[PDB]
Structure formats: C-alpha cells, structure tokens
UniProtKB/Swiss-Prot annotation, chain A:
UniProt protein name: Spike protein S2'
Native organism: Severe acute respiratory syndrome coronavirus 2 (2019-nCoV)
Biological function: Subunit of the fusion protein that is processed upon entry into the host cell. Mediates fusion of the virion and cellular membranes by functioning as a class I viral fusion protein. Contains a viral fusion peptide that is unmasked after S2 cleavage. This cleavage can occur at the cell membrane by host TMPRSS2 or during endocytosis by host CSTL. In either case, this triggers an extensive and irreversible conformational change that leads to fusion of the viral envelope with the cellular cytoplasmic membrane, releasing viral genomic RNA into the host cell cytoplasm.
Length: 49, 49
C-alpha cells in the first residue's frame, strides 16, 4: 500500500479510492494475524505435550 | 495571477515549506475551466501537515 498508517490513507484518497488501499492493509494484517494464531496453535501442541 | 509560465520541462517552482500554504484564497471550486484532482482538494488540505 501507500502507507502503513491508516490515517495517511483516510486523509489522502477519496472514500471510493481509499477502499482499494484499505483492503490491502486489512487483508495483509489478517494474514499476519492468522499466521500468528496458526503458529501459536502449533506451539500450543508443543507446550501441552 | 502570474503574467506567463514556463515550458513543461522548464516549470517554475516556488518552495514554501510548513504544513499550510494558504487556506484564505481557494479558487479550487468552479473558478476555472477544467478540474482533474487526486487525493484531497485544497479545501481539505487544512487538516494535512
């Protein structure tokens, strides 16, 4: 995206144009959070073992 | 209000720093022939530093 800060995207692009860059930030952070949760479930199986 | 401009490659630039250039005089609303804008209008630049 253009900037990692959402406020820079909201204060720059129009509401129709901002939806393109905001979806890139959300989907990327969803994958970053899902990867974290997936890795924690793997470490959960290791610590329970 | 300048008398004449330069060429496309000769473009004259005036560097004035800080967040705000001028909020008092705004011709951005229906004052000229053709408006093609990106980002925010000069009216919305008052909140951007």
């Amino acid at each position: 995206a253009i900037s990692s800060v959402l406020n820079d995207i909201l204060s720059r692009l129009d509401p129709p144009e901002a939806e393109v860059q905001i979806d890139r930030l959300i989907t990327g952070r969803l994958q970053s959070l899902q990867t974290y949760v997936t890795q924690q479930l793997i470490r959960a199986a290791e610590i329970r073992a | 209000n300048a008398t004449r401009f330069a060429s496309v490659y000769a473009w004259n630039r005036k560097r004035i720093s800080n967040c705000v250039a001028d909020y008092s005089v705004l011709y951005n609303s229906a004052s000229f022939s053709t408006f093609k804008c990106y980002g925010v209008s000069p009216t919305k630049l008052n909140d951007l530093c």
